[PDB]
Design a protein around this ligand. Structure first.
Ligand SMILES: [Zn+2]
Length: 128
């Protein structure tokens, strides 16, 4: 929609989009995450995490190492540009970040860091 996107994470470990475009005129960009379904956070948790395509693996490995209680994200990880909390079904969370944190010609990825989900739950984010 205008400088924002609503995205869903379901019980089959799927996001309903796999490509996000952010227009350079946006001062800010907002992602609104929801989780349709019935499974709880500890079985099917999903968060929306954004980093460069280069940093994603490091973010995923260290996130797995943080624990459920840490939302499977390394606290104050410098490589995460923006992220929601980890949510279960029926829950909701949003994040607004400044678009100046992204630069032209850099590849970005969004993904879920919940153990085992990033292999299937990821997509690209692009500044146009
Ligand atoms: Zn997930």
């Amino acid at each position: 929609a205008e400088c924002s996107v609503d995205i869903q994470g379901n019980d089959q470990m799927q996001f309903n989009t796999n490509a996000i475009t952010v227009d350079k005129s946006c001062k800010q960009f907002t992602v609104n995450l929801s989780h349709p379904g019935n499974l709880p956070k500890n079985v099917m948790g999903h968060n929306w995490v954004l980093s460069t395509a280069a940093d994603m693996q490091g973010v995923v490995t260290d996130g797995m190492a943080s624990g459920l209680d840490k939302d499977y994200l390394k606290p104050d990880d410098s490589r995460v540009i923006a992220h929601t909390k980890l949510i279960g079904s029926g829950e909701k969370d949003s994040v607004t970040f400044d678009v100046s944190k992204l630069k032209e010609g850099e590849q970005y990825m969004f993904f879920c860091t919940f153990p085992g989900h990033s292999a299937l739950m990821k997509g690209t984010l692009t500044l146009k």
